[PDB]
């Protein structure tokens, strides 16, 4: 499990797992410890209900850009595990959720 450190107010731009191959529909999730995971980013730009404008991914237009997830202005409550389910076209089906990254907030 790869850790990551960020402070209060800084734009946390966490990385992804495997390399992007062709088209992309990334699936970003915030897995809280003990609770249920929450959907954050689907189809590289869209957000579901209950999520503000802070959580946003990179839209895959003119491929060659790596997939990241920007968290602008983090708090103490939004400090949990993160997953990046990479769905592409040159690998077929995706059965694993990739390498989980753990966000840590100092303070």
């Amino acid at each position, epitope marked *: 499990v790869r850790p990551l450190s960020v402070a209060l107010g800084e734009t946390a731009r966490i990385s992804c797992g495997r390399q992007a191959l062709g*088209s992309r529909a990334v699936q970003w999730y915030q897995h809280r410890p003990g609770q249920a995971p929450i959907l954050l980013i689907y*189809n590289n730009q869209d957000r579901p209900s209950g999520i503000p404008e802070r959580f946003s991914g990179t839209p895959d237009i003119n491929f060659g850009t790596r997939a990241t997830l920007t968290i602008s202005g983090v708090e103490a409550g939004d400090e949990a595990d993160y997953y990046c389910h990479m769905w*592409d*076209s040159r690998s077929g089906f995706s059965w694993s959720f990739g*390498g989980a990254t753990r966000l840590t907030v100092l303070g």
Partner: nanobody
Amino acid sequence: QVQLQESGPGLVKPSETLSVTCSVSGDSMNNYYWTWIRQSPGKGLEWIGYISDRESATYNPSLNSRVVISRDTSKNQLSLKLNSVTPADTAVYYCATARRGQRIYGVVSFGEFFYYYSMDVWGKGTTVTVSS
């Protein structure tokens, strides 16, 4: 509201099946594609399979095909049955749903589209610990 109660057994033995349940009341006719998602200590979130109206439940290749599934409209619920358990399978088994959306990258008559699975509504998850 999608209600998802988890009446799992909790304490299982080797050479015993699973009986974790999830019953949905509400907007649950055919569109919300249900699935099973687990979380072990150390091992990440393993998407072990889903079930649709086509009755083709594709399972995980790392699961080694030891899981049969059962969704019925008489009891109005979804159950899981895992056989020949291992002591590293002390996981929290969530019963969530997904929406299968396509991503077109070319011509639709040439098969240039692939499907993803976006999990939007989640459940609680019960702590089924394998006891030897």
